[PDB]
Structure 1
Amino acid sequence: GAQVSTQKTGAHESIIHYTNINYYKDAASNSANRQDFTQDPGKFTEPVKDIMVKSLPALN
């Protein structure tokens, strides 16, 4: 009971995917999640209550 997902694209602008099967009983044995790419800068660059529209003054 296998999974097929896409490969990271290389040297050019269907054969661009790979297949994987897990052979172990523990999730710890699995390979790394190198393909997950989320992001949320907000937690850090903009943790202000009161939304700053910035195109407007920011004070006044």
Structure 2
Amino acid sequence: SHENSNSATEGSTINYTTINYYKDSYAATAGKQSLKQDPDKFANPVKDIFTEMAAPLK
């Protein structure tokens, strides 16, 4: 469709597949999100990454 781009997610690293009938995108459904993940951002935010095999304190 040729609608406005007022969705709160317009321009997200994860694309959505939604349904809409009005001219404003934020009225659309929630749809399906893309299944990407980045655990390391929170679980391993270390500068100099350390291997599993090796001892963490070299």
TM range (shorter): 0.5 to 0.7
Secondary structure of the residue aligned to 2:36 is: coil
Please state which structure has a larger fraction of its residues in strand: 1
1:36 maps to 34
How many residue pairs match? The answer is: 42
Offset of 1:49 from its aligned partner? Answer: 0.2
Identity %: 45
The root-mean-square deviation of aligned C-alpha atoms, in Å, is: 2.0
TM-score, length basis structure 1: 0.56
Counterpart-to-counterpart distance in 2, 1:56 and 1:21: 50
- Relative contact order higher in (CA < 8 Å, ≥ 6 apart): 2
Any residues of structure 2 matched to 1:16-55 within 5 Å, and which?
A: 22-55=20-53
